[PDB]
Paper text:
Pol α-primase is a constitutive heterotetramer composed of a dimeric primase (PRIM1 and PRIM2 in H. sapiens [human], Pri1 and Pri2 in budding yeast) and a dimeric DNA polymerase (POLA1 and POLA2 in human, Pol1 and Pol12 in budding yeast). During eukaryotic DNA replication, Pol α-primase generates primers at replication origins to start leading-strand synthesis and every few hundred nucleotides during discontinuous lagging-strand replication. Pol α-primase binds directly to the leading edge of the CMG (CDC45-MCM-GINS) replicative helicase via a complex interaction network. The non-catalytic PRIM2/Pri2 subunit forms two interfaces with CMG that are critical for in vitro DNA replication and yeast cell growth. These interactions position the primase catalytic subunit PRIM1/Pri1 directly above the exit channel for lagging-strand template single-stranded DNA (ssDNA), revealing why priming occurs efficiently only on the lagging-strand template and elucidating a mechanism for Pol α-primase to overcome competition from RPA to initiate primer synthesis.
Residue numbers in the entry:
A (entry chain A): 96 to 114, 170 to 598
B (entry chain G): 94 to 223
C (entry chain B): 1279 to 1445, 1448 to 1458
D (entry chain P): 1 to 5, 17 to 252
Amino acid sequence: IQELIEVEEEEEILLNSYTVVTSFGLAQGVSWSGRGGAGNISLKVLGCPEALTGSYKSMFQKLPDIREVLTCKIEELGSELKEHYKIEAFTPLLAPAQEPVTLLGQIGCDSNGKLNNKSVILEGDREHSSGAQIPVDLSELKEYSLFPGQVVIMEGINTTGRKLVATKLYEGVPLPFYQPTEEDADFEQSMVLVACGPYTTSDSITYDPLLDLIAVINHDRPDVCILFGPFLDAKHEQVENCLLTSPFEDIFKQCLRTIIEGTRSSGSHLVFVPSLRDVHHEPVYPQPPFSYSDLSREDKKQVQFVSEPCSLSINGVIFGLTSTDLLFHLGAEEISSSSGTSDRFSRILKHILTQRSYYPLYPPQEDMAIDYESFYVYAQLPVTPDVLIIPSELRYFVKDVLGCVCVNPGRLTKGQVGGTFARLYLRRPAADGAERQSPCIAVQVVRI
Amino acid sequence: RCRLMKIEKFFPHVLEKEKTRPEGEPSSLSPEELAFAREFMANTESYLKNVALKHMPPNLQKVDLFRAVPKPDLDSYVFLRVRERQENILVEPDTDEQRDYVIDLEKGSQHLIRYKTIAPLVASGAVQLI
Amino acid sequence: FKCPCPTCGTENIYDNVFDGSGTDMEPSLYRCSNIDCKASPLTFTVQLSNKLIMDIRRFIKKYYDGWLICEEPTCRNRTRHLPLQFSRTGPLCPACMKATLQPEYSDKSLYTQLCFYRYIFDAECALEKLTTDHEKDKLKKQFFTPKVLQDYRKLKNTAEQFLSRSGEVNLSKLFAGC
Amino acid sequence: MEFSGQRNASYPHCLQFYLQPPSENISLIEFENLAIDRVKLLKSVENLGVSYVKGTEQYQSKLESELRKLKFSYRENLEDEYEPRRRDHISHFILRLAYCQSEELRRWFIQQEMDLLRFRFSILPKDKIQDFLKDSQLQFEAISDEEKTLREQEIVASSPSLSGLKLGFESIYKIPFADALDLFRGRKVYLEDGFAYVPLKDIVAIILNEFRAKLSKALALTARSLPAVQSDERLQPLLNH
């Protein structure tokens, strides 16, 4: 069609030449849009001891590596809490004690079932406890909240040297917050969009929620868009039955191409985070960034690919990123006697921030293939984030926990039907302030 | 005399550049040179129009001197001598990024290099052409 | 390896580059196992690569699930948790407290399985391993054209991506010997 | 005018002495075949021995064809022979473990190695000798070379084996009688006041001797230290058969 139109144009010319579901921070009434990324926006990835920039030697751990990882986490956070609480020493778990004694260890379960208040065990460090284990009774504690893999310090009675009567439980403590630069002061109010897969109804590869989200991005013109996998869900019906007529990787590249070419007119900057449900991508947590090549120079300046999990500085505001359903995983495994107003998701988020990790649960949940060395090297916080983005199949929420704005956008589809996404506003508080206030001033969750 | 040769040779380009110039940047033409250039432009166009173009078919009576007249060739090679030290100058052989590299210009040395890379240094007075 | 045919729904089983043996050798991707079906698996290699991705991910997941079992036959305790109380023969089991735990599906097992996945679609290697030139000529002239070899190579590459992500013998570790 | 604009360091010469461990990666089939082809070479050296006399031109001509066919290091080339050199290095480390299974097998492969080394040292041009003696620990400094003509007279009068031409083309340098041990104790040649007027081949004998000593220490280490590496040993029976 078009070629003939151009031929006819040449012929005519040549011839004629001779003639809202949830809100936070008093978000309502304010207009919701971005500057289309045209402001002084900046995106930088953080990590300690390093950031997850690329693939690693997976599938090849040995059990001493896993022992070392768990031991190092116990002793590192135990040393931090020892200094914080000014504790003198830790008694070995195997040592009998008629009076209360202070002990360092990690919470675990005596069997493969979900943790309960009778199946609790405490597993010690290598330095003081030689890695030993002891069963625990929590009923003498006035309050508690615990889960497997959690590093804790306890004081209790151990008359046999082989069972612990806990009398006090020392809480975990988060890292200090970030200290944004003068470049992070030379910026003005900005808007961030958050969305998480599947970007399809789980019965159809037609990517209708993706087109709806692209329309939302073009309509609102946000400054940054954080997009979490699955971009091609392993739990999708056509994917699971492997009926699709193109390779998973090509379909994923088409998905990214659809987002990038559809949203190029918005100007919005794009951040891409994987999920273990990304069928084309590595099935192992932590996942490295995606691999992609269709970018133009404008797209290269606007698009960035990051790991699962990831710590991202947005104009100096630290966003903690994990597509993993750690909320569902910890909800199935956390135990407590907190019968008061301490909400379940609040306790889970507090545990995430205090344990300084994007997956402190051990043993991991039944879908979570975890490489423990890469988890030790990449999945631990460099600083306490300002914003914690954590999607889940469980219902969306927004909460302020320990000074961090925790956001669960849900998922963009509830399997075969449409779901939710989220939007955030950033504005740094005045430099005269004596103490940190949240740089994230307002948040909302919206249906697709 | 030399400046006048260059004005006569590239008249549409120097005229258009001066017409475009933003405020605060120096001109390439003194006022008398600009007056001379404007006269030259008008005179040349008039001669061609009167001698041949009025007799052409109606669809061919216009021509664009901005397109017909060539442009200054900034890829020319030159010799030079430096009067102040300079650092991190990028040299591009060919035009494949895999061959790009950088050099430093020490005080009182002499070099042979393409004019396009050094053009800000000549305008700033850091180097001398010899 | 097992995968359903998109044309007739039967589940085809793959164990080699070839089906049959001797003079009756043929590509395992040549025709469907349903004798009444005309479909050729060389026409749905994309679906096979997709299923290969899912199955290899299942085996990698099985390795990373953390399952351990005790060595002692009177104990046989099964756990997903690694006890940090190690000994001269590894992690000491909490059920017996007399013998140690070992993985149910080890790294060497997963590496062997990934090599097997690579092998069953490594048409070039399989053709080179044939013992007579007659078989090589027949299989190349009748079936394994460059197009068919490229299809087999795409399935091979599907396995090779996971092998490249796996931890390849480290030469430096052999100097932990002598 | 003055203008402006990695594996060389690994093996500046085809000669190598296995001091540095190659701290990199390998494939299963790669280390397998790297070693097994050299097993064939070890047998082939002695098959050539039973064919005809050691080290003759017939030996030389056939032997280099074995190396070209078998893709291992050569008379030293200026193009990328560093790949054959590192293959030779890596495969040498791999070969330590197969025929350590018995001392007779150890001695067998050592003997064909000595024959191969003697051949390679026989091939050497002068520039190779000049740079390897300085680049290696095998220094063996020369002293007062102008006196060699007084020994051109004296050696010639005093030796059945040596001759005036050998003074120059088997270029003579001064080192002790003990570095010519078999020659002093057999009293075969002119040595005086405990010093020997020595060509390269005596230092080759010393190279072979210290190579044997270091290799024997390595074989003892192979017998002792190896069990942590022995997660797989399936090739060992096929190798000892």
